[PDB]
Amino acid sequence: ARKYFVAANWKCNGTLESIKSLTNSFNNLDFDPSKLDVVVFPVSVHYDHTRKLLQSKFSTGIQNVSKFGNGSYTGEVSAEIAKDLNIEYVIIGHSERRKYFHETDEDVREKLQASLKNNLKAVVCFGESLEQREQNKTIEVITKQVKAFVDLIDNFDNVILVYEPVWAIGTKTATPEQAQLVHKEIRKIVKDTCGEKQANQIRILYGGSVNTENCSSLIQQEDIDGFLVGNASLKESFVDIIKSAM
Amino acid sequence: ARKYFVAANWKCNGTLESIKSLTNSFNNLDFDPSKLDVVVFPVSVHYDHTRKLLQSKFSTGIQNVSKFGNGSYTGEVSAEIAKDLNIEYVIIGHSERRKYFHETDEDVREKLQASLKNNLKAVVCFGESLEQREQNKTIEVITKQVKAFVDLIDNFDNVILVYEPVWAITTATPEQAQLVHKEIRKIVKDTCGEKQANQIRILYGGSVNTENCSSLIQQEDIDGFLVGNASLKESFVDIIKSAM
């Protein structure tokens, strides 16, 4: 049914040289992009270098997008600009942006609306805190977070959800069964808010700590459709993680 | 004599095509980079395109930089990364970032620090609100904003100040701007020394266009500008000329 989706969030890391080396390793993997989505999210200033280096079987995107259009928004990258550059994907709502940059559910909603308007595909992150989990609020928190934006989705292939177990960020970690349980609940939320067919198509990624050791166990879960990978994505062995989804 | 510095803040504007024509027009202007600094600040994803297209007489920079180093800061660009790419300049503390993204004085201080640590050159922005101006607090506010970071400056060619009359963003007269600029230079002198204060460029960051640019730059203490909408136009070259 669902096409699996493996994403590398490089976060704020890299040099021109490190990228050349890593993309080179990545290019050695022969996968079929018609069957699997594999997306790399470099730093904005690294995007051109990275895109040029990566073979086109690899999709590419950026780690954040403006909630505003073009105009007087110094330091921001608009969805129109991304579209002009053929930047395919954007990450929205990463826990780090919510933490450091005070991004809200409202910002996430705006960014999503902007991205969709400009025919961008969106990878939208959410998840609950340790305290929220301790107080048994996980479902309540996620439901609010999803409902913040979910009504905007028209094409359920073009928005991809990520569950971040923010409570884990260390410490840690969710068992694969524990993630699966959350992913199943997220899909129910989509089903009841959007519709069953829609909930059945949408990809839901695990956004916790993923590595060569746990990826197979994670992808095997019924409602886990892929991953947004952090530190492990900075390593040549990331290809092994992609392989788990092949 | 201070070397004049004219900057294009493209803000969140451009396409590959528009930049291609705009840079070509700019390239037609014959100027000597040893006599003035002309810096272009494209959107981040436009940096390589712009840098390639612009001839070397033009300097380039980015519109913001992280206060954090490399690491788990999704969506940020580190000073280290900018250094690796030989991105020469960064803008810090622009009023838009203060307004929309809640950037503080402390943020500005940390951003400057990261930049200097990484041998980037910094164009640092500040200025008072309408309420602050109406309340006759302009000096108190400016002194506070400047003293937030000014002590960090280790080379007075490499950090450039910009006064943004945010109050007027809905202008300042050139005479009004000149008085603020002089006041800024006096704060720098008070904190950094006289020779240092004489050396540092202080730019006007209010609305600049081909009409008003000469009137501003000819003021004793206004050393150039950080230019907005006008910098998106082929006639931006006429603004540069006011500094030539």
Curated annotation (Swiss-Prot), chain A:
GO terms for biological process: gluconeogenesis; glyceraldehyde-3-phosphate biosynthetic process; glycerol catabolic process; glycolytic process. Keywords: Gluconeogenesis, Glycolysis, Isomerase. PROSITE patterns: TIM_1 (PS00171), TIM_2 (PS51440). It is an enzyme of class 5 (isomerase). One of its GO terms (molecular function) is identical protein binding. One of its GO terms (cellular component) is cytosol. D-glyceraldehyde 3-phosphate binds at residues 9, 11, 170, 228, 230-231. Changing residue 72 to A: 3-fold decrease in substrate affinity. It catalyses: D-glyceraldehyde 3-phosphate = dihydroxyacetone phosphate. The active site is at 94 (electrophile), 164 (proton acceptor). Its EC number is 5.3.1.1. It comes from the Eukaryota. Pathway: Carbohydrate biosynthesis; gluconeogenesis; Carbohydrate degradation; glycolysis; D-glyceraldehyde 3-phosphate from glycerone phosphate: step 1/1. It holds the Pfam family TIM. InterPro entries: Aldolase_TIM, TIM_sf, TrioseP_Isoase_bac/euk, Triosephosphate_isomerase, Triosephosphate_isomerase_AS. Belongs to the triosephosphate isomerase family. Catalyzes the interconversion of glyceraldehyde 3-phosphate and dihydroxyacetone phosphate in the glycolytic and gluconeogenic pathways. HAMAP family: TIM_B (MF_00147_B). Homodimer. This is Triosephosphate isomerase. The lineage of its organism: Eukaryota, Sar, Alveolata, Apicomplexa, Aconoidasida. The gene is TPI.
